[PDB]
Amino acid sequence: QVQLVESGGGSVQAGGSLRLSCAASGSISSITYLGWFRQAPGKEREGVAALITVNGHTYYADSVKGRFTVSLDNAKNTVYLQMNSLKPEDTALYYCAAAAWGYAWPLHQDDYWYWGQGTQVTVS
Amino acid sequence: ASVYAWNRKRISNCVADYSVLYNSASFSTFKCYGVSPTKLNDLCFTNVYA
Amino acid sequence: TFEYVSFKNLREFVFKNIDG
Description:
The structure is cut from a larger assembly and holds 1 copy of chain A and 2 copies of chain B. Chain A has one domain: Immunoglobulins (Immunoglobulin-like). Chain A has no helices and 11 strands. Chain A has strands spanning about 5, 10, 20-25, 35-40, 45-50, 60, 70-75, 80-85, 90-100, 115, 120-124. In chain A, a hairpin with a 5-residue loop joins strand 5 and strand 6 (about 60). Helices cover about 10% and strands about 0% of the residues of chain B. Chain B contains 1 helix and no strands. Chains in contact: A-B, B-C. Chains A and B meet through loops of A and loops of B. Chain C: This is Spike protein S1. Chain C: It comes from Severe acute respiratory syndrome coronavirus 2.
């Protein structure tokens, strides 16, 4: 019942900047938790960014700590993911996920999420 | 408590606020089944064993 | 599963158990 549309991807060099987005449509007030995923070629899809919609609390992984920021825009109904200080280990497919049951740090693939279509982010 | 002795304690005839739990800034795997945690504070149910 | 705190005198009472 919740549809996620994500964009903002593209190719940028090392040390550059990007800014992903993920718009939500449907039962918006029931969604309590937005988490950003990342699946490298040859690696499992892990948890990178986390954001409670009700609380505003942000949780970040240890490989992206001090570089990655997540923000919520309730007026435009779209969660953001600003990419700062990029390194070439970030070449992966990124996914935005929504939860209507609560928050769980660390992110897990086997939980019930509303999955998007994924955006390619390529850095070199 | 222990897991060989997790007693079925009855806390009754009072009120439990849950809005400080979301602002406790320490929860890791906060999992609510059935009903959403947004609609936990306003509506309650029987058998509130812990 | 409860607790409470409360000839010349005639302490009348009437008790009813309906609808649980």
